[PDB]
Amino acid sequence: QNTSGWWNAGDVPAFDKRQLSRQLPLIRVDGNRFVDEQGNVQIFRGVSISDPNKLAKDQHFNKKHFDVIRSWGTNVVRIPVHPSAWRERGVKGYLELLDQAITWNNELGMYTIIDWHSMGNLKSEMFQNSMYHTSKGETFDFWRRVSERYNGINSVAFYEIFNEPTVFSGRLGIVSWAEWKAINEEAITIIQAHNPNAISLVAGFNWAYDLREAAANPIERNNVAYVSHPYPQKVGAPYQANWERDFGFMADKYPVFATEIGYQLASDKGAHIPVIDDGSYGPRITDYFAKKGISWVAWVFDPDWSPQMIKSWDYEPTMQGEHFRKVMLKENK
């Protein structure tokens, strides 16, 4: 942290919007669903890239990477900004990556989710791992900078406050839904004061799985949607009834953006709980979300991070890539 940390970074040059030729339709929350300016329901079906910091190191942070994503039918790209990578590149250096990613998405007709990709208990400052480490100050500062910088770019529609809240059964300490609600409310006040049209994606606990505590005491802000990460082994059979109880019912009251789903075989690279399945979860979760009108983002247009959507940098789809591509090609554009 010279002039690269959130608390000491210099003036940051504004984003030059003369790189953009495209203004996608403005999305807003209307009760239960996302709608455009005509009140037509929008459903988003897309992919997470890996952290731009990793893409740039791997030499695949280029237009071709984003053209392939678009060619899969993708109408939304999720950008998981790891606070670790934000510190490694510094504020200025990281915003150059994020500007370029957003430019490529925008020109290809794809909406963006900016995801502050942490994991654990922000209030108590206990994270799954050092790569997720952040603070309330750094988190608020990030949302202050990106909400202002991308204000008026309709394609940058969604602001995902904090990827995966969890206390890991007390290993990461204690936080009530009430305390988490207050932190989300402050983050959304920051976002809306810089960016009147920003939609905010709010998560509950058990790694952004549960929405029952959210439903009982919802975020008192406009333009809010609720996140779940219903990975294959978060619950067992019967799947649809369990999903409905835990998060799906929330789609009746607010839009639900399942910002991570994915799956691979127990034999596939980096296979771990809760991402292991025989392949039946793919159609099951996709069909469930079609019945419910739920937006979703498959985890990870990357050949290294698990579960993989692509087998290598030749961009051949994996089992999960094949399935999500088929659904995005049929049901999106």
Author numbering: 6 to 338
Manuscript excerpt for this entry:
Cellvibrio japonicus is a saprotrophic bacterium which possesses the remarkable ability to grow in isolation using a variety of hemicellulosic polysaccharides as sole carbon sources. It produces a diverse collection of GHs, assembling enzyme systems that can degrade cellulose, xylans, mannans, and xyloglucans, among others. Effective xyloglucan-degrading GH systems (recently reviewed by Attia and Brumer) contain exo-acting glycosidases acting as debranching accessory enzymes and endo-acting enzymes (xyloglucanases) that generate short, branched β-(1,4)-glucan oligomers (xyloglucan oligosaccharides).18−23Exo-acting enzymes are expected to address each of the glycosidic linkages reported in xyloglucan branches, though the reported enzyme diversity falls short of reported branch diversity. The work presented here comprises the design and validation of trisaccharidic xyloglucan (“XyG”)-type cyclophellitol probes and their validation as bona fide, predictive tools for the identification of xyloglucanase activities and their discrimination from cellulase activities within a xyloglucan-elicited C. japonicus degradome.
Not having been previously functionally or structurally characterized in detail, we produced and purified Cel5B and Cel5C recombinantly in E. coli to assess further the correlation between probe reactivity and enzyme specificity. We found that Cel5B and Cel5C were both cellulases, efficiently degrading carboxymethylcellulose and mixed-linkage β-glucan. Cel5B showed only weak activity toward tamarind xyloglucan while Cel5C had weak activity toward carob galactomannan and no detectable xyloglucanase activity. To determine the molecular basis for the reactivity of ABP-XyG-Cy5 with CjCel5B but not CjCel5C, we crystallized both enzymes and solved their structures by molecular replacement in both unliganded and ABP-bound forms. Cel3A/B and Cel5C showed no change in expression under any condition tested, indicating that these are constitutively expressed.
